[PDB]
Design an enzyme around this catalytic site. Structure first.
Site, PDB file in Angstrom:
ATOM      1  CG  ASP A  55       1.034   4.699  15.250  1.00  0.00           C
ATOM      2  OD1 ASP A  55       0.514   4.370  14.163  1.00  0.00           O
ATOM      3  OD2 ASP A  55       2.019   4.107  15.737  1.00  0.00           O
ATOM      4  CB  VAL A  74      -0.985  -0.002   1.190  1.00  0.00           C
ATOM      5  CG1 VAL A  74      -1.906   1.202   1.114  1.00  0.00           C
ATOM      6  CG2 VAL A  74      -1.752  -1.306   1.237  1.00  0.00           C
ATOM      7  CB  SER A  93       6.874   2.971   2.575  1.00  0.00           C
ATOM      8  OG  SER A  93       7.851   2.428   3.447  1.00  0.00           O
ATOM      9  CB  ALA A 106      10.069   7.539   8.714  1.00  0.00           C
ATOM     10  CE1 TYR A 107      10.936   6.951  12.610  1.00  0.00           C
ATOM     11  CE2 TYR A 107       8.753   7.188  13.557  1.00  0.00           C
ATOM     12  CZ  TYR A 107      10.003   7.704  13.292  1.00  0.00           C
ATOM     13  OH  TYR A 107      10.322   8.976  13.708  1.00  0.00           O
ATOM     14  N   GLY A 108       8.407   1.969   8.929  1.00  0.00           N
ATOM     15  CA  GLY A 108       7.857   0.716   8.452  1.00  0.00           C
ATOM     16  C   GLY A 108       7.066   0.830   7.167  1.00  0.00           C
ATOM     17  CE  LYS A 111       4.467   0.832  11.312  1.00  0.00           C
ATOM     18  NZ  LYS A 111       3.986   1.945  12.178  1.00  0.00           N
ATOM     19  CB  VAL A 129       1.415  -0.364   5.322  1.00  0.00           C
ATOM     20  CG1 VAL A 129       0.059  -0.988   5.613  1.00  0.00           C
ATOM     21  CG2 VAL A 129       1.900   0.453   6.509  1.00  0.00           C
TER      22      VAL A 129
HETATM   23  C1  LIG Z   1      -0.993  -1.783   9.062  1.00  0.00           C
HETATM   24  O1  LIG Z   1      -0.077  -0.751   9.370  1.00  0.00           O
HETATM   25  C2  LIG Z   1      -0.131  -0.304  10.707  1.00  0.00           C
HETATM   26  C3  LIG Z   1      -0.179  -1.224  11.767  1.00  0.00           C
HETATM   27  C4  LIG Z   1      -0.231  -0.766  13.086  1.00  0.00           C
HETATM   28  C5  LIG Z   1      -0.234   0.600  13.349  1.00  0.00           C
HETATM   29  C6  LIG Z   1      -0.186   1.505  12.301  1.00  0.00           C
HETATM   30  C7  LIG Z   1      -0.138   1.072  10.978  1.00  0.00           C
HETATM   31  N1  LIG Z   1      -0.083   2.051   9.883  1.00  0.00           N
HETATM   32  C8  LIG Z   1      -1.151   2.141   8.875  1.00  0.00           C
HETATM   33  C9  LIG Z   1      -2.367   1.450   9.026  1.00  0.00           C
HETATM   34  C10 LIG Z   1      -3.353   1.573   8.035  1.00  0.00           C
HETATM   35  C11 LIG Z   1      -4.689   1.054   7.805  1.00  0.00           C
HETATM   36  N2  LIG Z   1      -5.121   1.546   6.660  1.00  0.00           N
HETATM   37  N3  LIG Z   1      -4.178   2.315   6.184  1.00  0.00           N
HETATM   38  C12 LIG Z   1      -4.311   3.017   4.903  1.00  0.00           C
HETATM   39  C13 LIG Z   1      -3.972   4.370   4.656  1.00  0.00           C
HETATM   40  S1  LIG Z   1      -4.276   4.766   3.000  1.00  0.00           S
HETATM   41  C14 LIG Z   1      -4.828   3.195   2.632  1.00  0.00           C
HETATM   42  C15 LIG Z   1      -5.322   2.705   1.260  1.00  0.00           C
HETATM   43  O2  LIG Z   1      -5.010   3.272   0.263  1.00  0.00           O
HETATM   44  N4  LIG Z   1      -6.182   1.516   1.224  1.00  0.00           N
HETATM   45  C16 LIG Z   1      -6.730   0.948  -0.142  1.00  0.00           C
HETATM   46  C17 LIG Z   1      -5.689   0.425  -0.900  1.00  0.00           C
HETATM   47  O3  LIG Z   1      -6.268  -1.053  -0.492  1.00  0.00           O
HETATM   48  C18 LIG Z   1      -7.524  -0.173   0.081  1.00  0.00           C
HETATM   49  C19 LIG Z   1      -4.788   2.370   3.747  1.00  0.00           C
HETATM   50  C20 LIG Z   1      -3.097   2.401   6.897  1.00  0.00           C
HETATM   51  C21 LIG Z   1      -1.896   3.078   6.759  1.00  0.00           C
HETATM   52  C22 LIG Z   1      -0.931   2.945   7.751  1.00  0.00           C
HETATM   53  F1  LIG Z   1       0.258   3.608   7.626  1.00  0.00           F
HETATM   54  C1  LIG Z   2      -3.343   6.347  18.150  1.00  0.00           C
HETATM   55  C2  LIG Z   2      -2.683   7.260  19.181  1.00  0.00           C
HETATM   56  C3  LIG Z   2      -1.548   8.045  18.524  1.00  0.00           C
HETATM   57  C4  LIG Z   2      -0.451   8.324  19.551  1.00  0.00           C
HETATM   58  C5  LIG Z   2       0.460   9.431  19.024  1.00  0.00           C
HETATM   59  C6  LIG Z   2       1.925   9.065  19.253  1.00  0.00           C
HETATM   60  C7  LIG Z   2       2.591   8.737  17.918  1.00  0.00           C
HETATM   61  C8  LIG Z   2       2.793  10.006  17.093  1.00  0.00           C
HETATM   62  O1  LIG Z   2       3.597  10.910  17.796  1.00  0.00           O
HETATM   63  C9  LIG Z   2       4.949  10.557  17.928  1.00  0.00           C
HETATM   64  O2  LIG Z   2       5.237  10.365  19.282  1.00  0.00           O
HETATM   65  C10 LIG Z   2       5.453  11.527  20.030  1.00  0.00           C
HETATM   66  C11 LIG Z   2       4.600  11.442  21.302  1.00  0.00           C
HETATM   67  O3  LIG Z   2       4.199  12.727  21.704  1.00  0.00           O
HETATM   68  C12 LIG Z   2       5.089  12.811  19.301  1.00  0.00           C
HETATM   69  O4  LIG Z   2       5.372  13.905  20.124  1.00  0.00           O
HETATM   70  C13 LIG Z   2       5.960  12.897  18.065  1.00  0.00           C
HETATM   71  O5  LIG Z   2       5.559  13.982  17.277  1.00  0.00           O
HETATM   72  C14 LIG Z   2       5.812  11.621  17.253  1.00  0.00           C
HETATM   73  O6  LIG Z   2       7.082  11.061  17.035  1.00  0.00           O
END
Ligand SMILES: COc1ccccc1Nc1cc2cnn(-c3csc(C(=O)NC4COC4)c3)c2cc1F
Ligand SMILES: CCCCCCCCO[C@@H]1O[C@H](CO)[C@@H](O)[C@H](O)[C@H]1O
Ligand SMILES: CCCCCCCCO[C@@H]1O[C@H](CO)[C@@H](O)[C@H](O)[C@H]1O
Length: 341
Positions: free
Chosen positions: A164, A26, A28, A30-32, A49, A34
Site C-alpha cells: 500500500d 530497513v 522509512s 511518510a506515515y511510518g 512497521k 519499518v
Molecule cells: C512492515 O511494514 C509494513 C506493514 C504493513 C503494511 C505495509 C508495510 N510496509 C512495508 C512492508 C514491507 C515488507 N518488505 N518490505 C521491504 C521493501 S525493501 C525491503 C528490503 O530491503 N529487505 C531486505 C533487507 O532485509 C531483507 C523490504 C517492506 C517495505 C514496506 F514499506
Molecule cells: C494493498 C492494496 C493497496 C491499496 C491502495 C491504497 C493505499 C495507496 O493509496 C493511497 O490511498 C488513496 C486511495 O485511493 C490513493 O488514492 C492515494 O494516492 C494514496 O494516498
C-alpha cells in the site's frame, strides 16, 4: 497479553512483544518506519512497521483506521498481508501507538531495475504477479492510484507483493495516468493498468518511459508516444483550459510501439499497446491482461482469485479524533492472525 521490551532505533522508541527479536531498520516512509525482525514463534524474519503519529490529528487518525481496515482485508499472495497487529497499550486511554507485522521481502523494484537487465521471462513473471494482485484488489472495488516501483516488494525468488505504501528511504508523477494529472476527479480502475504499463516498459528497456519534469511536461511526453487525443476523447473533457491547451498543441501522431520497444518480445509489445491508451474505458483490465498470450506460461484461471466485497463507507464520514481512535482500537483487538502454514 504478551511481554514487551523497549529500545530506541533511529531516534525512535520501539515497544514490541518478546517474540520479535533482533530489530533492524530497513527504511522509512511518510506515515511510518519499518524494521526487520526475527519472529521466534515461526523462525522466519518479518517486517514490523511502527505508524508515525497515528492519532495526532483527524487526518492521521482516519488514515490509521484506513490502513488497518484495508490491510486486515487483504488476503492474497501478491498483496501485502497482516501477520500481526499489536499496541503496547492495555486500555483505550493508553492507546497511542500502532505496529503492523508482515512478511519481510528482499527489496524494492527500484533495486531490481538498478541491475537494468531483466530477462523477458523475469518480466512475464513479475508483471503477471502485479496483474494477479491487481485483479484481487480491483475485485474488492479498491483503486491503488499510486502504483510505482517502490510499491513492488520482491524476493530473490522473484516473488512479488504489492505494498500500500513503499519505503521512501522516483517522482511518482512518472507512473500516473493522464486523467489523474488532469484532475478528472473520478478514476477508472484502469488508472492502475496505466501505471503497470509504465512499470513494464521500464523493466524491458531499462529506462523510464515518461521521465517528465512536471505535470504538463509529463502529459507532453505521453502525447508523443500515444499521439494527440482523438475527437471522441476531447468531447469528454469539460475543462475548457484543458481542452484549449491540449488542442492548441502542435499535434503529433501515435508512434508504433514496435519501433520504440524494438527488440522486446512482440507479445509484450502487444500487451503494452493495450495498456497505454489514453481512454481509460479502452485500457485492458487486470483480469483480461492475465489472459493475454504474453502470460501463457503462468496463467491459470482457477488460481487467480477475487476478494470479498470491501466496505469503504467510513470514507464519507467526518468523525472526531477519539472516534477514529476507538474504531482503530476495536480493529486491533478484533485481529485474528492467519494460521502458520
Ligand atoms: C512492515 O511494514 C509494513 C506493514 C504493513 C503494511 C505495509 C508495510 N510496509 C512495508 C512492508 C514491507 C515488507 N518488505 N518490505 C521491504 C521493501 S525493501 C525491503 C528490503 O530491503 N529487505 C531486505 C533487507 O532485509 C531483507 C523490504 C517492506 C517495505 C514496506 F514499506
Ligand atoms: C494493498 C492494496 C493497496 C491499496 C491502495 C491504497 C493505499 C495507496 O493509496 C493511497 O490511498 C488513496 C486511495 O485511493 C490513493 O488514492 C492515494 O494516492 C494514496 O494516498
Ligand atoms: C492530456 C492527454 C489527454 C488525456 C486523456 C485522458 C482520458 C482518460 O480517459 C477518460 O477517463 C475518465 C475518468 O478518468 C473517464 O470518465 C472517461 O470516460 C475516459 O475516457
Amino acid at each position: 497479553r504478551p511481554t514487551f521490551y523497549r529500545q530506541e532505533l533511529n531516534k525512535t522508541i520501539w515497544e514490541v512483544p518478546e517474540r520479535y527479536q533482533n530489530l533492524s531498520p530497513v527504511g522509512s516512509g511518510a506515515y511510518g518506519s519499518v524494521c526487520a525482525a526475527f519472529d521466534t514463534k515461526t523462525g522466519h524474519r518479518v517486517a514490523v512497521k511502527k505508524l508515525s503519529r497515528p492519532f495526532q490529528s483527524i487526518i492521521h487518525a482516519k488514515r490509521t483506521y484506513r490502513e488497518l481496515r484495508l490491510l486486515k482485508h487483504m488476503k492474497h499472495e501478491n498483496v501485502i498481508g497482516l501477520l500481526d497487529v499489536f499496541t503496547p497499550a492495555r486500555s483505550l486511554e493508553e492507546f497511542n501507538d500502532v505496529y503492523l507485522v508482515t512478511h519481510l521481502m528482499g527489496a524494492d523494484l527500484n533495486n531490481i531495475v538498478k541491475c537494468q537487465k531483466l530477462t523477458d521471462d523475469h518480466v512475464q513473471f513479475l508483471i503477471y504477479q502485479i496483474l494477479r494482485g491487481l485483479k484481487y484488489i480491483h475485485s474488492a472495488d479498491i483503486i491503488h492510484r499510486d502504483l510505482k516501483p517502490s510499491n513492488l516488494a520482491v524476493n530473490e525468488d522473484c516473488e512479488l507483493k504489492i505494498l500500500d505504501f513503499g519505503l521512501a528511504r522516483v517522482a511518482t508523477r512518472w507512473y500516473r495516468a493522464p486523467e489523474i494529472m488532469l484532475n478528472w476527479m473520478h478514476y477508472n480502475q484502469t488508472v492502475d493498468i496505466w501505471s503497470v504499463g509504465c512499470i513494464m516498459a521500464e523493466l524491458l528497456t531499462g529506462r523510464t518511459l515518461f521521465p517528465g519534469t512536471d505535470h504538463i511536461d509529463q502529459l507532453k511526453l505521453i502525447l508523443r508516444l500515444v499521439g494527440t487525443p482523438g475527437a471522441e476523447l476531447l468531447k469528454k473533457i469539460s475543462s475548457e483550459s484543458a481542452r484549449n491547451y491540449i488542442q492548441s498543441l502542435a499535434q503529433m501522431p501515435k508512434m508504433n510501439f514496435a519501433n520504440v520497444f524494438i527488440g522486446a518480445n512482440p507479445l509484450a509489445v502487444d500487451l503494452l499497446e493495450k495498456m497505454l491508451v489514453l481512454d481509460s474505458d479502452k485500457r485492458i483490465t487486470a483480469a483480461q491482461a492475465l489472459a493475454h498470450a504474453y502470460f501463457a506460461q503462468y496463467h491459470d484461471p482457477d488460481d487467480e482469485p477475487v476478494a470479498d466485497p470491501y466496505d469503504q463507507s467510513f470514507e464519507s464520514r467526518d468523525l472526531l479524533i477519539d472516534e477514529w481512535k476507538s474504531l482503530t482500537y476495536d480493529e486491533v483487538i478484533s485481529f485474528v492472525p492467519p494460521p502458520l502454514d
